[PDB]
Amino acid sequence: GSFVEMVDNLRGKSGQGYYVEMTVGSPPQTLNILVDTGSSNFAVGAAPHPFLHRYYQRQLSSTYRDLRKGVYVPYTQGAWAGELGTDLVSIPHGPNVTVRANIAAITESDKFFINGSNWEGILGLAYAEIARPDDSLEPFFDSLVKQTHVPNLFSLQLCGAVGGSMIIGGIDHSLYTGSLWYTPIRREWYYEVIIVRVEINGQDLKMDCKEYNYDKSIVDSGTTNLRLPKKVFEAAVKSIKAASSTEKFPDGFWLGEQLVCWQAGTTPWNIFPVISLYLMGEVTNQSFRITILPQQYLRPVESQDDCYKFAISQSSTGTVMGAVIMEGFYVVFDRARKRIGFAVSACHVHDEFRTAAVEGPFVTLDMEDCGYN
Ligand SMILES: CC(=O)Nc1c(Cl)cc(CNC(=N)NC(=O)Cn2ccc3ccc(C#N)cc32)cc1Cl
């Protein structure tokens, strides 16, 4: 394939984010940057911190330009503050171009950096609307498209336990099997989609699709869990408990407050159900379903023991399809045609009885009502 040099450009530790090497400034400073499809700022640590091995040094970059403007980015648990500026940016194992991009130099932070994660910055891949301080601040990818020939499209293959590929400018066919199925992007801020139905072990959850998309549903690579709206989570957990009732688990396991460990080799994946999301398709009344295995939603925590954490958690900000979902699939963010594609990942962790799947088409009536306004 012609994108061979971008294959395998992602690394990471489990549950700690996938990162790509970027070089910034001149002479080259190379940094490990978190790949996040749920945000829109390019930001790098620019001061020493206990969790950072290296960081961006602006005074050593002759091409660094100061924007004389501070930036503050709050998240749910953490936050960071820093200074805005521009510099030359490249991705060594990505497309062969260099761009002048906005960089947020992070000079202070709370619970943002992860001990041992080996990354020191974040690459926001979503649209300008959700950028701090405001929309006038062109996100990295927008800058890439404007200044260069690179087609307005990228794709992600995150392989679970860690590594994967971020293909920029195209689609690499060795990364997936079967056909690609596309769902429209509802609005360009987050990568927003519409879930029209949810099944556990082929059994329908029987809720109004409005509930599945309450607030919004997004595809977000810098989040670990599949997060479901309060009511949907409650129902889903009932159904999963019922589907795996040949075994018993403490109530805190389903809330992620407890772990269960099996002896090495013996996890009974067979007792947990497959989970299915149906997404609106590209044609009236047409949908398709993506289906994930326990190997995706039970995550290992790093002896003689294998400990697992349930990785479906409740949300107050709608559905977030994080790495739990994405590690099953090759995902194509086709920004040029306002659509997102899913195909079975050539490298998804599976066993011999069941595999992740993307199947279609299905007929779902009145899908237009499922979105929130
Ligand atoms: C240690 C850690 O969690 N670091 C971290 C942090 Cl603080 C923020 C990010 C930002 N990227 C995200 N894709 N997502 C979030 O931060 C989660 N989050 C971001 C905004 C936000 C708002 C409401 C809720 C709820 N409920 C959750 C929210 C990435 C990482 Cl790795």
Author numbering: -3 to 157, 170 to 310, 315 to 385
Which of the paper's sentences describe this entry?
Based on the amyloid hypothesis, BACE1 is recognized as an important drug target since it is the rate-limited enzyme during the production of Aβ and initializes the cleavage of APP.
Nitrile group was the optimal substitutent on indole, especially, when the nitrile group was introduce into the 6-position of indole (compound 25), the most potent analog was identified, which was nearly 23-fold more potent than compound 19 and >1,000-fold more potent than the fragment hit resulting from virtual screening (compound 4, IC50 > 100 µM). This subpocket located at the opposite of flap loop, which is under-explored in previous studies on the discovery of BACE1 inhibitors. The superimposition of structures of BACE1 in complex with compounds 19, 25 and the initial docked fragment are also shown.
